[PDB]
Amino acid sequence: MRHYEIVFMVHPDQSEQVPGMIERYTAAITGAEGKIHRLEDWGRRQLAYPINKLHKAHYVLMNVEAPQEVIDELETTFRFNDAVIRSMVMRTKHAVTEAS
Amino acid sequence: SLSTEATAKIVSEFGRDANDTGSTEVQVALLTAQINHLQGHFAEHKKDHHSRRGLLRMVSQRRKLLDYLKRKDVARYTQLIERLGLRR
Amino acid sequence: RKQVSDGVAHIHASFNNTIVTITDRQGNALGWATAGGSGFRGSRKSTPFAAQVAAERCADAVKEYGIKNLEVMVKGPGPGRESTIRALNAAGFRITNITDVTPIPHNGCRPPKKRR
Amino acid sequence: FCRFTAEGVQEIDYKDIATLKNYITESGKIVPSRITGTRAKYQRQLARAIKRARYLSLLPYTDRH
Amino acid sequence: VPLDGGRFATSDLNDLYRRVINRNNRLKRLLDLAAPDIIVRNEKRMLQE
Amino acid sequence: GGDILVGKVTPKGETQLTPEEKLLRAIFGEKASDVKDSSLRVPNGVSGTVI
Amino acid sequence: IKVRENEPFDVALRRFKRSCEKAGVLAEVRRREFYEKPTTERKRAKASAVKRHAKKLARENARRT
RNA sequence: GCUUGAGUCUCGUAGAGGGGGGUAGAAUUCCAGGUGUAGCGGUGAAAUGCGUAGAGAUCUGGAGGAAUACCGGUGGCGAAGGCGGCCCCCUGGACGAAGACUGACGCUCAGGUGCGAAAGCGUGGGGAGCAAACAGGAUUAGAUACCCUGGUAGUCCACGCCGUAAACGAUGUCGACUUGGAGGUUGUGCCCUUGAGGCGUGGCUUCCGGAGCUAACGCGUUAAGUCGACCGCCUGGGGAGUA
RNA sequence: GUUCCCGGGCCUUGUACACACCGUAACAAGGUAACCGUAGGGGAACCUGCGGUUGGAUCACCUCCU
């Protein structure tokens, strides 16, 4: 219903087992009335400051039109999933697709 | 705030038009229904020292709204409270 | 001793005391020098010439380790911060990089109560 | 004066951060209004984007940690 | 009209009147300090060219 | 008419820059307003078909 | 903050430290907060800086000397 | 009954606005370990204290607590007080393009009620930094004062009471009226927004001034100018904003 | 040569002064800026912490970039 730009990062060591993680979350969006606009994938880019041991996390983007109550519980999933350490949801009304 | 898909319902009922939300029988309803949607705010958290003035504002504008409807036509007045239920 | 070339020289000129200390890249301290131990106790503790002698005290008794390219990382915006740097360049060193990693809080704790 | 807020109408994004790098420095500092002639609208929009990128380690906070 | 870079694409007529004005003030100076005739007349030939 | 066929980069000059854009040269970069676009152009009155 | 200039220098040149902050962070975290005080001297300062602009506007019309 | 008053709806906007909670990072204090010196702190100067039971200082790791540098801008929100990191949940106030309506439903107001910085106290947690009472060294004729080493209430969070102020651009509140420029800040309409613009329409706020007022300073479209409406206040100060 | 020093003069800045410079608390920046509110203490003025305001002073020099 509303637009939520869920941008998140997993660790470079989880960059090899993250595609399974992607199918996890996107399947849930389809089971929660939703449609993806851009599965933006850059790669494992260098972090400015290493997080307690290593830098270079892996960035993956959603930018999905989805209901606020399911994404809320979805954010709880991210919060207690230790691969995805930094994950935030953005503004509504417009989720983009370009600039990659 | 009063969500839009509750608002449009209320306006088309009380009013003849869908834009007829300026008639007192509708002005008061959307004000009361706005507080009915605001109950979820003053029921929890309790310390809204800013939203406090907002309540006093819209409800006072309603006390005098019902004031003139009272003095002009007691038939539609008792009808406003008989179609929504904003007396008590 | 310990054999180090890159000596992280933290020079902390606060307000009325300037401390110069070269440490190891890892962290093993090498030798220190202060505006208060070389003498100059007073408004002289707040002078860059005292900081120049502080650099000189941190120039000798440290050749036992033998640093050349040193990371003079300056802390605390104080009196010296250049007289001390050129004291080291005229001491026989080659400062590979002068960094400004001063003790910076994001206005974390409150500042201290002093001066009037 | 600048050609980023002229040919760049409507909210400057931050996926590719190269444009915010025109408005920050190589230290991690944010450029002030008086240098590049850029009215606050564009200026504070960049502001929102920047805070977000630093939380996600795209942009650094200070120089060194 | 200087040349875009650091040179002169100008009508070097200016670079010519330049010397004319140089030598002009020169002989008037040789009136003030009163220099010998053979050289002020040498300047006559100079402003002449 | 006067279309562009191929583009030609060409040095411009410090003479061509104002003090207002000598501040933006210390920020943005050197090769931004240093070289201009003086490409190969089709003079007025010439038609053609690139083959 | 971090200046290097390879190896031909024989000079410090901490000119970026000053172009960063230097005394910037210090002005607020050296002596007690006082909260409202700096605000006061901000008004006085502006009154004399804007008057400097009024000064630049007063000299343009005559200054016949 | 009719509208130039108030107000509502459809479509959008920015933010230190408030309540509850979670989280990231630096620095200060302390503890343990690697290293090492003979000094650290501070002041106009000095000194108590710490220290050879290896302090101050640096690096790695860790447990608490308070507060958010740069961005910062007589910038922003708000009735006011007051309030700067980010986000989630609930949600308020202000404003604008183009239309539809009830048809003055508007304003203020003693007794009253609510909000009410900071601080004090009762209670459950708590303590890095600073700091009433107090101990010590001195400038001094003296120090219960400037300064410094320690340190309790407190500072912080939640529930109440006291319900106090320079709660002061000292400018009470709503509406109407009155040549402009530089700005700052937030939207929209129109035109080649081709490009960092031009011409209008509202809110908040700053400086220079005209009409006007005043003792003067100066305020000046946000007025100390011109009116209507409502409440409170003064009749020399001290005594006393007290018993 | 006017920065050092003794005297004179012009302009400017500030004053609750003009009767005209037991402890100095305010008025010069009173050499610790002032004032109101809250709590506590001290022979006494007031002091310390916190919030706010202008019924406040100088924005004069010494070193670095075209």
Distance of alpha carbon F41 from the chain centroid: 12
E43 three-state secondary structure: helix
**Across the interface, which of A7, A51, A99 has its CB nearest the CB of D16?**
A99
Count the Cβ atoms, other than its own, within 10 Å of residue C62: 20
DSSP string, chain D: --STTTSS-S----SSGGGGGGSB-SSSPBPPTTTTT--HHHHHHHHHHHHHHHHTTSS-SSS--
Between strands A41-43 and E7-8, the pairing is unpaired
Resolution at which this structure was determined, Å: 7.9
Asked whether F and A share 3 or more beta-carbon pairs under 8 angstroms, the answer is no
Distance between CA atoms of residues F50 and F42, nearest Å? 12
The structure tokens listed for G18 are 């000053």
Distance between CA atoms of residues C75 and C98, nearest Å? 11
| CATH class held by domain B1-88 | mainly alpha
Pick from D45, D46, D57: nearest CA to A8: D57
Please tell me if residue D60 touches chain A, with a CB cutoff of 8 Å. Answer: yes
Question: Do A28 and A4 contact (CB within 8 A), yes or no?
Answer: no
Give the CA C116 to C1' H145 distance in Å: 14
**G56 CB-contact burial (10 Å; exposed 0-12 / middle 13-18 / buried 19+):** exposed
Sorted by where each begins, the domain ranges of chain B are 1-88
Distance between CA atoms of residues D38 and C76, nearest Å? 34
Q: How near does any CA of chain A get to the CA of D15, in Å? A: 6
Instruction: Say which residue the tokens 């409800």 belong to.
Output: B59
B/e letters for D21-33, b = 16+ CB within 10 Å, e = fewer, are: ebbbeebbeebee
**Cβ separation of D65 and A51 shorter than 8 Å?**
no
G64 three-state secondary structure: coil
Contacts of A15 (CB under 8 A, 6+ apart): A44, A58
Sorted by where each begins, the domain ranges of chain A are 1-92
Q: How near does any CA of chain D get to the CA of G16, in Å? A: 10
Count the Cβ atoms, other than its own, within 10 Å of residue C55: 27
Solving technique? cryo-EM
Question: Do A100 and A42 contact (CB within 8 A), yes or no?
Answer: yes
